[PDB]
Structure 1
Amino acid sequence: VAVPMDSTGPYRTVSHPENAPSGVDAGVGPSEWTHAYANPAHNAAFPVPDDAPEWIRNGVSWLFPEARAWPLANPPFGSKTYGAAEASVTQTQFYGNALGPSVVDGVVYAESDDMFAYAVNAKTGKLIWRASPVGNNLMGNPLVIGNTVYLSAGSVAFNSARGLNVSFNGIYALNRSNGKLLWYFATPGETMATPAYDNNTLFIADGAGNAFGINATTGKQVWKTHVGGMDNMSSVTAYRHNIYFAMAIKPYLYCLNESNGHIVWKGTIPGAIGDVSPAAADGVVVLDATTSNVIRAFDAKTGAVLWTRNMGSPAFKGGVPMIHNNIVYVGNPVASTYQAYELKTGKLLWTWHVPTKGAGRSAPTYYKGLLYITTGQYIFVVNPATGKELHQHHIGGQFGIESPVIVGGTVYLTNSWDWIMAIPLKTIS
C-alpha cells in the first residue's frame, strides 16, 4: 500500500530478519494479543510452560532506546518552559510510549508517540523491525493476531471532534514478520484508543463519535455506528461477542453487538470518561472516571448498575481497572492510591497509598499471586491479600498508563521517555 514515504529515508520500514526468534524462542509468551493490556480483564500476566526456555524463566535484562530515547535519570524534557508535570505529560503524548508493550511468540511489539512501531527480540532486545506508515502519534499497544500487527493512529490535539484533520488517523495493519504495510483504514477522528480484535474483526471508536467494525483481513468496513461524543483513551473491550467502550463530551459507556454494531445498552458515571478503558470478567463490566474518582460496575448483558463506589478525593482522569479472581484492582489518581473491590458486591477489601515520592493511572498486573504496579518512576510489588507494599524497584523515566507485561520470570515494559526494556522478575523482588 502506497503512503507518503521516501523508501530510502528515515521513516522507511527497516527489518533485521536475523534478529527474529526461531524454534522454541518463537513459542515464548502468548500467541495473540487482542486488547489493550492483552485481554478484557486487563491482566497482562503470562505463566510459561515447564518446557519453556531457561532465559524467559530465569529472566533477561535489556534496554532498547526508541527513536526519541531520553535518559531515564533525566527530568522531563521541557520542565523549565512547561512545568515538570505538564512537561512529563507532553513528553508521554508526543515522544514516548503511552501504553505498555505486547509480547507474542518471543517478540516484544511497541508503538510510540515518536510515530514508530517497533518489534524487538524478547530475549536479546535487538531490533527485528521498525515502521512508520503514518506521520501521526501511536498511543496504544500493538494488537498481534496471527501474522498481522495492528496499530491505531491519532493525536491528543484538535485542529467537536478530537484529531480531525490533525495528521491522519485510523488503523494501520502491518506484516508481523517484516513490518511491511498491509492495509490501512482511515477514520475521520483520532483513534488513540486501542482497538479490540474478535472473530476476524477489529473494533474501534474515534474522536469523531464513530464506532467501527472492520474486517481484520481485508481492512474493509463491516459496520459504522455513530454514537457521538469522542473516544479519547478508552480502548475497546470485546467480551462474549459484544464490545464495550466509553465516550466523552456525550458521557456514555456503550455496549454494541459485534456483528452489526447495534447499541445494546448505555450507562453513565455521575459527574461527567472517554479516558478509561472498561474491563470485563464473569458477566460484569467495570469502569471508573474522575468527577473525586467514581468506580461503577455494570451487568455485561443489560448494563444494569451492580454497584457504585466513591474511591476518595490529573491529566488522565481515572485508573485503568484490572479484574482477577472476581476482584477489581484499580487506581485512584486523585488520591494516589490503589484499591481492591469485590467484583459482584462492591465490597472494599483494602487501600494502598502510593509512597509520596501520575500515581494510580495504570492497571496493576496480578502474576503468580502478587500485584505488580508501574507508576511514576517505579515498579512496586504489593500483596493482593493485604494491600501492603512488599518490594519497590526504581527504574526512572515515567510510566503514565503503562502496565507491567509479565512472562515467565521476565518483566517487559515501555517508558514515557521512549524506551522498551526487559527486567528479571527476581531483580524486582
Structure 2
Amino acid sequence: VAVPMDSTGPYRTVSHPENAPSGVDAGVGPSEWTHAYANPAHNAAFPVPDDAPEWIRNGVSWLFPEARAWPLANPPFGSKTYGAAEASVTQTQFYGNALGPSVVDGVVYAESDDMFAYAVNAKTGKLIWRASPVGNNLMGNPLVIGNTVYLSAGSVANVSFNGIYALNRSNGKLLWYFATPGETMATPAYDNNTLFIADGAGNAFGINATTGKQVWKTHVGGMDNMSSVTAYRHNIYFAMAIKPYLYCLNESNGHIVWKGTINVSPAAADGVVVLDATTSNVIRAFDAKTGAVLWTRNKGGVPMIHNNIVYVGNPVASTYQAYELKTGKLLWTWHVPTGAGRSAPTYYKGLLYITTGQYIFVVNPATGKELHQHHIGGQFGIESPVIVGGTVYLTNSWDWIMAIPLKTI
C-alpha cells in the first residue's frame, strides 16, 4: 500500500528487532488491547502471576524520549507568547501524547501528536519500531490485536488527513488505512474482527479489522471530538457533539439500537453505561441494553468503573468523586491540591492512581484521602496510568514514554 513517503527519509519506519522482548518477556501483560484505556471500564490495571519474571514484579524504571521530547523540569515551551495554561494545552495538543500507552505482551505502544507511533520494550525501554504512516496527529492509544496495531489520525481543529491506519505489530510496516472525512481523534473500538469509529461529519463505520475494507456506514450526525467508541456486549456506544446524544449501534449491521441524552469516553460495566458532560458537570448512567436512564446526578471527566463503583473527575471543581454504579450517590470527593480531573483513575490492588498535572497521586478508594504523591514533571492532560505487575507505564504531554516501579510512588 502506498502513502506519501521517502523510504530513506526521516518519516521512514525504523525497526530494531533485537530489543523486542522474547520468551517469558513476551508474555508479560495482556495479549490484546481493544479499547481506549484497554477495556470498556476504563480501568487498565493488570496483575501478573506469582511466577512472573522478576523485572515486572519488582518493577522497572526507564525513560524514553519521543521525537519532540521536552525536558520534564522545563515550563511549557512558548511561555511568553500564549501564556502558561494555553501553552500547556497547546504543547499537549500538537507535540506530546494526548492519551496513555498500550501494554501488550511485553511491549509498550504509544502514539503521539508528533505524528509517530512507538513500540517500546516494557523492560528495557529500547525501541522495537517507530512509524509515521500519516502526516497528522495521533490522539489516542494504539489498539493491539493479534499482529496488527491500529492507529487513529486526526487533529484538534479538511484539515490534514483522518482515519484509521493499521500496521504490523512486529516490524511496524503499513498494512492498510481507511480514510474518513471527519475527525478520528476518538479511539476506535475492536470487537470480533471489526473496528468501530465515528467521524466529525456525523458518520459511524464498522470496518473489517483484517482486510481494511468498509463493513457498514450509518449517519448519526454531529461531531465526535474526544469521545472514543466503546464496544460492549456486541454493541458500540459513542457520544456526538453539536447534537448532544449518546448512541448505541449494532456492531454487525450498523443499525441504531437506542439514543440517550443529558469529549468524554463513556464507560460500561455490569450492564450500565456512564457518561458525564457540561452545559456544571452532570453524570448519568444508562441501562446498556435498553437505553433507559438508570440515574442522574449533578470539560468533564473520563469515568472508570471497578467493583460497581464509578470514579470520575470534575474539571470545573478539580475533583475526583466515587459514585455507586447503580444508585449514583457520591461516596466521597477528593480535592486536588492547588487542569486536574481530566484523566481516568486507575484502581489496582486496593488503591487509586491518578495522573494529573505533573504528579502521579495515590488515593485511598475507601475514604478518598490522598496517601502519597510523586513528582514527575511535564504534563498529564488525559493520560491515565497503566499498571502491569509492579511497574507503572506512562506517557506525558512533553513527549515521553516512561516506566516507573510501583513501589517508588
With the length of structure 2 as denominator, give the TM-score of the two structures.
Answer: 0.99
Q: Tell me, what secondary structure is at the counterpart of 1:190?
A: coil
1:309 positional shift: 1.1
1:16 counterpart residue number: 16
Q: Tell me, what secondary structure is at the counterpart of 1:245?
A: strand
Q: Tell me, what secondary structure is at the counterpart of 1:380?
A: strand
Q: Tell me, what secondary structure is at the counterpart of 2:337?
A: coil
1:78 positional shift: 1.3
Q: Deviations over 1:383-406 (max 9, x none)?
A: 000000001000100000011000
1:222 counterpart residue number: 215
- For structure 1, which runs of at least 5 residues remain unmatched after alignment? 157-164, 269-274, 311-316
Q: Deviations over 1:312-343 (max 9, x none)?
A: xxxxx110000000000000000100000000
Distance 1:222 1:262 in 2: 12
Distance 1:209 1:155 in 2: 16
Q: Deviations over 1:33-75 (max 9, x none)?
A: 0000000000000000112100000000000000000000111
1:307 counterpart residue number: 295
Choose the corresponding residue for 1:318, options 300, 305, 317: 300
1:30 positional shift: 0.2
Distance 1:258 1:53 in 2: 38
1:174 positional shift: 0.4
1:348 positional shift: 1.1
Q: Tell me, what secondary structure is at the counterpart of 1:87?
A: helix
Q: Does 1:175 align with 2:133?
A: no
Distance 1:207 1:220 in 2: 20
1:245 positional shift: 0.5
Q: How many residues align?
A: 407
1:9 positional shift: 0.3
- For structure 2, which runs of at least 5 residues remain unmatched after alignment? none
Distance 1:382 1:262 in 2: 42
Q: Deviations over 1:94-132 (max 9, x none)?
A: 100000000000000000000000000000000100000
1:293 positional shift: 0.9
Distance 2:92 2:219 in 1: 30
Q: Deviations over 1:198-247 (max 9, x none)?
A: 01000000111110000000001100111000001000100000000000
Q: Deviations over 1:111-164 (max 9, x none)?
A: 0000000000000000100000000000000000010000000011xxxxxxxx
Distance 1:334 1:262 in 2: 36
1:291 positional shift: 1.8
Q: Does 1:331 align with 2:281?
A: no
1:190 positional shift: 1.6
Distance 2:225 2:218 in 1: 17
Q: Tell me, what secondary structure is at the counterpart of 1:393?
A: strand
Q: Deviations over 1:266-306 (max 9, x none)?
A: 111xxxxxx00000000000000122111110010111111
Q: Does 1:405 align with 2:386?
A: yes
Distance 2:385 2:81 in 1: 31
Distance 2:80 2:279 in 1: 30
Distance 1:208 1:79 in 2: 35
Distance 2:370 2:12 in 1: 45
Distance 1:254 1:247 in 2: 8
1:361 counterpart residue number: 342
1:80 positional shift: 1.1
Q: Which runs of 4+ in 1 moved over 6 A?
A: none
Distance 2:370 2:384 in 1: 17
Q: Does 1:278 align with 2:266?
A: yes
1:79 positional shift: 2.2
Distance 1:252 1:96 in 2: 30
Q: Tell me, what secondary structure is at the counterpart of 1:32?
A: coil
2:7 counterpart residue number: 7
Q: Tell me, what secondary structure is at the counterpart of 1:134?
A: coil
Distance 1:359 1:77 in 2: 20
Q: Tell me, what secondary structure is at the counterpart of 2:92?
A: helix
Q: Tell me, what secondary structure is at the counterpart of 1:114?
A: coil
Distance 1:198 1:50 in 2: 30
Percent identity of equivalent pairs? 100
Q: Which segment is superposed worse, 30-39 or 72-81? A: 72-81
Distance 1:79 1:224 in 2: 44
Q: Tell me, what secondary structure is at the counterpart of 1:80?
A: helix
Aligned-residue RMSD, C-alpha: 0.5
Q: Tell me, what secondary structure is at the counterpart of 2:285?
A: strand
Q: Does 1:263 align with 2:256?
A: yes
Q: Tell me, what secondary structure is at the counterpart of 1:376?
A: strand
Q: Does 1:293 align with 2:281?
A: yes
Distance 2:38 2:313 in 1: 18
2:182 counterpart residue number: 189
2:96 counterpart residue number: 96
